[PDB]
Amino acid sequence: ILGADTSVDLEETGRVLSIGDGIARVHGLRNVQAEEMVEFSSGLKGMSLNLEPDNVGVVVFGNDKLIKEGDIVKRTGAIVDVPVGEELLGRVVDALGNAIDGKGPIGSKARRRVGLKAPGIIPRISVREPMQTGIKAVDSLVPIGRGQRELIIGDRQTGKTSIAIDTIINQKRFNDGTDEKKKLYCIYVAIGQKRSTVAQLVKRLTDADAMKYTIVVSATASDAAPLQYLAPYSGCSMGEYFRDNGKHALIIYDDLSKQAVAYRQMSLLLRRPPGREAYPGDVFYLHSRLLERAAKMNDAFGGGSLTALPVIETQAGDVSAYIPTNVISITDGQIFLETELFYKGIRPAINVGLSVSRVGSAAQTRAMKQVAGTMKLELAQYREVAAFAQFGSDLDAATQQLLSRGVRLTELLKQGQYSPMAIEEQVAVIYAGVRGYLDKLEPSKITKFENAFLSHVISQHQALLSKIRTDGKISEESDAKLKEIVTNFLAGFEA
Amino acid sequence: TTGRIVAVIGAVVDVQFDEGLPPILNALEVQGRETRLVLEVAQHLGESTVRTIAMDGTEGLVRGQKVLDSGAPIRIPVGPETLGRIMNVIGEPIDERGPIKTKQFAAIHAEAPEFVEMSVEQEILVTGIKVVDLLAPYAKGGKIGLFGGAGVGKTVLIMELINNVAKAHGGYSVFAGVGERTREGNDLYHEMIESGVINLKDATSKVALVYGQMNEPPGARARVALTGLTVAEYFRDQEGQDVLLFIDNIFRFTQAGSEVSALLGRIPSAVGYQPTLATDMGTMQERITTTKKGSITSVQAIYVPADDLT
Amino acid sequence: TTGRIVAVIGAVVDVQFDEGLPPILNALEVQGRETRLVLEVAQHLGESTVRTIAMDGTEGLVRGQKVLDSGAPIRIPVGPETLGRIMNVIGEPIDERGPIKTKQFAAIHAEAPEFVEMSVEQEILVTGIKVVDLLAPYAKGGKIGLFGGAGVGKTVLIMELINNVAKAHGGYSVFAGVGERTREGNDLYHEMIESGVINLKDATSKVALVYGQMNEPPGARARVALTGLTVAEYFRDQEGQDVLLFIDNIFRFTQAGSEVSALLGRIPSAVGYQPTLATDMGTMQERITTTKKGSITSVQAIYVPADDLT
Ligand SMILES: Nc1ncnc2c1ncn2[C@@H]1O[C@H](COP(=O)(O)OP(=O)(O)NP(=O)(O)O)[C@@H](O)[C@H]1O
Ligand SMILES: Nc1ncnc2c1ncn2[C@@H]1O[C@H](COP(=O)(O)OP(=O)(O)NP(=O)(O)O)[C@@H](O)[C@H]1O
Ligand SMILES: Nc1ncnc2c1ncn2[C@@H]1O[C@H](COP(=O)(O)OP(=O)(O)O)[C@@H](O)[C@H]1O
Ligand SMILES: Oc1ccc(/C=C/c2cc(O)cc(O)c2)cc1
Ligand SMILES: [Mg+2]
Ligand SMILES: [Mg+2]
Ligand SMILES: [Mg+2]
Numbered sequence A: 001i002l003g004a005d006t007s008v009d010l011e012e013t014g015r016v017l018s019i020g021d022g023i024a025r026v027h028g029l030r031n032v033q034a035e036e037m038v039e040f041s042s043g044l045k046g047m048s049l050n051l052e053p054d055n056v057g058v059v060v061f062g063n064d065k066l067i068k069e070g071d072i073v074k075r076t077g078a079i080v081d082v083p084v085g086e087e088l089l090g091r092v093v094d095a096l097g098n099a100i101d102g103k104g105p106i107g108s109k110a111r112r113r114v115g116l117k118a119p120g121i122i123p124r125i126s127v128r129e130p131m132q133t134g135i136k137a138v139d140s141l142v143p144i145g146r147g148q149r150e151l152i153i154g155d156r157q158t159g160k161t162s163i164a165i166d167t168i169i170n171q172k173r174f175n176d177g178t179d180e181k182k183k184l185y186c187i188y189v190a191i192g193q194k195r196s197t198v199a200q201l202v203k204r205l206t207d208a209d210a211m212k213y214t215i216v217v218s219a220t221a222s223d224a225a226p227l228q229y230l231a232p233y234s235g236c237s238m239g240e241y242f243r244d245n246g247k248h249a250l251i252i253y254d255d256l257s258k259q260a261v262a263y264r265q266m267s268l269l270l271r272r273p274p275g276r277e278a279y280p281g282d283v284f285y286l287h288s289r290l291l292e293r294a295a296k297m298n299d300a301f302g303g304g305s306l307t308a309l310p311v312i313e314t315q316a317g318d319v320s321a322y323i324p325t326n327v328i329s330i331t332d333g334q335i336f337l338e339t340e341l342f343y344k345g346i347r348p349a350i351n352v353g354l355s356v357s358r359v360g361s362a363a364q365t366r367a368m369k370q371v372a373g374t375m376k377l378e379l380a381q382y383r384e385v386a387a388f389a390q391f392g393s394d395l396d397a398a399t400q401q402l403l404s405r406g407v408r409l410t411e412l413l414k415q416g417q418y419s420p421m422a423i424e425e426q427v428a429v430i431y432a433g434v435r436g437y438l439d440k441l442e443p444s445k446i447t448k449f450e451n452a453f454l455s456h457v458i459s460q461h462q463a464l465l466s467k468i469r470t471d472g473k474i475s476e477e478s479d480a481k482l483k484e485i486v487t488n489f490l491a492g493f494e495a
Numbered sequence B, C: 001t002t003g004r005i006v007a008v009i010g011a012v013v014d015v016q017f018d019e020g021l022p023p024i025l026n027a028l029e030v031q032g033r034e035t036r037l038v039l040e041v042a043q044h045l046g047e048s049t050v051r052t053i054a055m056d057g058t059e060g061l062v063r064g065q066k067v068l069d070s071g072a073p074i075r076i077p078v079g080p081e082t083l084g085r086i087m088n089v090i091g092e093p094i095d096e097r098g099p100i101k102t103k104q105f106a107a108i109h110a111e112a113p114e115f116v117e118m119s120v121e122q123e124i125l126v127t128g129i130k131v132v133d134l135l136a137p138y139a140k141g142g143k144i145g146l147f148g149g150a151g152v153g154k155t156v157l158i159m160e161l162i163n164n165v166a167k168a169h170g171g172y173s174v175f176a177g178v179g180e181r182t183r184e185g186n187d188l189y190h191e192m193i194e195s196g197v198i199n200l201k202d203a204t205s206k207v208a209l210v211y212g213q214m215n216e217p218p219g220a221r222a223r224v225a226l227t228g229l230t231v232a233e234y235f236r237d238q239e240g241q242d243v244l245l246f247i248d249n250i251f252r253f254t255q256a257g258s259e260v261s262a263l264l265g266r267i268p269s270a271v272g273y274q275p276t277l278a279t280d281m282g283t284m285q286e287r288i289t290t291t292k293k294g295s296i297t298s299v300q301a302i303y304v305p306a307d308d309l310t
Helices: A136-141 A160-170 A195-207 A225-243 A256-269 A283-291 A322-328 A339-344 A366-372 A375-388 A397-412 A423-434 A443-460 A462-471 A476-493 B130-135 B154-166 B182-195 B218-237 B251-260 B277-285 C130-135 C154-166 C182-195 C218-237 C251-263 C277-285
Strands: A013-020 A023-028 A036-040 A045-051 A056-060 A072-079 A081-084 A110-113 A151-154 A185-191 A214-219 A248-254 A305-313 A333-337 B002-009 B012-017 B027-030 B038-046 B049-054 B066-069 B075-078 B104-107 B143-148 B172-178 B207-212 B243-248 B296-303 C002-009 C012-017 C027-030 C038-046 C049-054 C066-069 C075-078 C104-107 C143-148 C172-178 C207-212 C243-248 C296-303
Touching (some): A081 A225, A136 A366, A136 A375, A136 A423, A151 A160, A151 A322, A160 A195, A160 A248, A160 A305, A185 A195, A185 A256, A195 A214, A256 A283, A256 C277, A283 A322, A283 B251, A366 A375, A366 A423, A375 A397, A397 A443, A423 A443, A423 A476, A462 A476, B075 B218, B154 B172, B154 B296, B172 B182, B172 B218, B182 B207, B251 B277, C012 C038, C075 C218, C104 C218, C154 C243, C154 C296, C172 C218, C207 C218, C218 C251
Parallel strands (some): A151 A305, A151 A333, A248 A305, B143 B296, C143 C296, C172 C243, C243 C296
Antiparallel strands (some): A013 A023, A013 A072, A023 A056, A036 A045, A036 A072, A081 A110, B002 B012, B002 B066, B027 B038, B038 B049, C002 C012, C027 C038, C027 C066, C075 C104
8 A cells, every 4th residue: 555645635735616817716725825825837826815615716927828727726835925135226027026137037135025014103203304306396396205105197198207217317326426325226116018118218227327226127018917916016025125224215106007907907807896986995005005115214223215106197187086086195295297288398297286295395405495495385376376367457566576486487497308407406596596586587598597507507616516415505605606696697698 | 712714805804603603893813813913793694604804914814713702892991091102903002112001991882972961062162273263163072074185284284283272282182093194193193292292201191192094904994993082982981071082084984994895795885885884984973072971172184085075 | 629518698608628628718619610610718617618709600509519629729821921811810811812821820829029029229200291290200110009089080091101101111011900891901902902012913912911890700809900910920020020010990809808708707897898908908919019020010090989088
């Protein structure tokens, strides 16, 4: 009598009952945990999401065509996790952490659960450190701090991704520097996009020498719904590695509209009844638990942080809709972009009234706060008065002044792409406007003036700019020096 | 009595008992977990099986895992020992300052005060906020609601109210963070340490904190409002005192209920909501009240989905 | 081996196999039919039964009818002898010109080119059309989409571009008619004969034709796009060459998937569509692409239901 083969018992393994649309229903697996990774005989992985009396509903991390009824499924013993660490920097990986850039295995030495709960109340401290985008309009009006979540939201082709790209590229001046604490490691999560678009993107980041401090997590349009669903949580864990180890990371989720669509798909196929707009009832929680994980840690937890810029695509400009407001109701503010603004020449196409930062000047250097502190409310009142004054007849001194200022500030917050600005340069430029030195300059000349002014202070007053950058403020001396530069230069400019 | 897990799908766990079935609302304790995992009984499904909502994550649960009936609903610490502390849904400290050494506990589920317990006294509570004071003033011991869509200023307003009214308040306050930002909870906490309404060194704290935020699964968010409310009820009744109750945000109780509703087997009502929306809100809201025994001035932030007040 | 039909509802046929269950995506041949009737495996239902999608009409089918597993997915002729020919969804000639005697066949299912296969070169393709060239220029080897509600000019535009870009093109072209007008296929065919881009006597035909129009049942309409695209892939890779791919109309693929999705047992998604709308679209669209190996300039007409771009 020979020994029986026990390799295939129904506690540690199972057999496929049915398989369709990326859902395997599995007999056995009596010892599996909820949210455990399992393995199919074909080498495919999957996640145990439904534990039922007579079956496990398994969600497949890949193509389901190799799965057949009766196939063997094995426990891994492990709650779904990803590789994590600095080894990921400069690499493009899939939602599971596998290299897809053709550059060989990631030699990562640590792993991390994708579903870890966001830190609670005690491990954190108030967001206080600037996360500079280098975009004047963001950094002045809707400033972002380290540990903050700030939403990028708007219709197709309004400039959402470009905000994120410019922000990543901007970090090179800190990352090439010698102040370790100012460095910011970047993570770009692509969800639902076409592969060739992600490739153009990393090509842009490479040419900008920004790949070297960026991880690209890609779950694109032909990747299975569970992969797209997981990608943000995978990237988040990769980001949490810096957060918990005294470093600072930035994560972009591009985009969460497409992720919520993949979650919808996956939930429907699991037979979980649809809710509003056919999304599951807990589509808020899908994103809430994700973004809560962007956080600023206190010194006892290392003082590190993770900052998040999730992206949401609206339809027909409606930021008030169900899904958009769900995500707005999570983040510490939103940058709302509109086509109308975009085509009128307001680029970046930020709607000031509808955008906010929920951290405010706490996230700004003192110098920026000095120039930008009241501008956001001021610009809101400006736009209102400009609409009310529309029928041009007798306007008092106060509103005419409000109008002249407003129209000129609007020109100053216009900005091109791919050259994010050093904070002190942003301050010098905004300064000329908020202090009124441009109030009699023709508004159409403002952009020509800024670029000439900037090249002048950069070449001629590197010491003034140095002092503002280093001091983090405009001293009485710096103020006196700036006034003398802009008044006399403008006069030259206007000759 | 011992039971066993027979199904897990998200926040909803089914548990079979061979002997005595735990009544609806009972807290069940999941065995073999690192941190306390409570399941609350929602329905008796028949065949000795109960349907429960979990108070924490269900990851790692295994079909067959043991569950003990505690014999009562979720019971939490109430009393002066809650002052200056942070508690979670199930009354565990989450401020890292050790045990909450109360003489007494209370179930988070209770009957609402009777009609004969009602008070009709109403006098102005001045806020120092022009638009509130002029057009729609608050009343001491009254029920105040702050409605707004995402990012219109509910939380800034409640914090201004805490700043203007609660800092110089003579009695106790409870703040219940319900399904909101953890960041905001850390902000408020350290702000209140700074102003001295929370004191980590003596017994002069005037505010109890109860938090279950949007990093939490729906069970925690659907019950954490009751935890906060139960704390305020003790102060109201077992001290007869003037209590301030701030809740941000009470919508998240209703939303949490909507997240589990399909898994609890309901046909949806309109706009994707549970059919029980109004009675659920009613049994909770009717406890948030001044009575003849004592006064609660309640201020509740009320989220407005898709900016639609309807 | 040999299976039996156990259920028929429109394009959805369930087939039971005693031994050897056919994998998903395999092509099954129904026995006892005058013309070839292919069923594509979509799901393993359990109990040795597979759920399939018919590639032609299912009238005349009887429960118990025999089905044979081909041992592979649908495979079509690819290469030079597709040029000047019209084929259907399963690669049969539909032009009355006899067999397509190719040496190569390829499966209509294939994984999309990997991330390393992508090209990053951006170069303008001048159309001669003012509004396009000025405001939203096309790119060589790029993906071009033409959005339009009923009757606003999708087909005219696609034909003008064939006239403007394709005329002066030193490569091969593929036109795939997907759920559109059969007589539009007849127009195009005879126009290309007249111009000589299709030659019925030479080997100098430069276009391959693939059609499954609005007379076809949903399974055929949901797959012909894969069929035409498969033809284009061969030219892109196995000649390395510059290919043009015209599709009128890609929306009809999604619409066709919508019609079988209920019959497949899926819970409907928004506006009654398949919950797999985006992933079905993704795994099809991501094959329509330029790679490092060769260029595909693709032009797709995209019907807009009820003029609603949302
Ligand atoms: N500041 C700017 N000035 C001028 N053009 C810009 C600016 N920012 C973005 N753009 C351009 O506007 C177009 C759309 O930008 P993009 O960042 O791709 O927006 P999006 O909303 O992410 N589009 P999609 O994701 O494709 O729906 C691109 O051509 C950008 O180069
Ligand atoms: N460029 C054009 N110049 C003049 N008339 C045009 C033009 N394009 C379309 N039309 C008119 O519109 C009709 C429909 O054009 P067509 O290109 O078939 O639109 P379509 O969007 O493909 N229709 P359908 O496929 O039924 O949704 C033509 O027969 C013309 O009468
Ligand atoms: N009273 C106010 N004064 C100035 N800014 C405000 C005020 N109230 C709100 N804001 C701006 O609006 C943002 C959102 O306010 P918040 O109270 O967080 O909204 P809600 O809680 O309703 O979502 C704030 O971070 C702030 O930037
Ligand atoms: O004329 C009409 C136009 C649109 C619709 C919408 C249907 C619909 C149904 C759902 O279950 C979810 C959803 O997001 C949309 C109905 C009628
Ligand atoms: Mg984008
Ligand atoms: Mg709030
Ligand atoms: Mg047409």
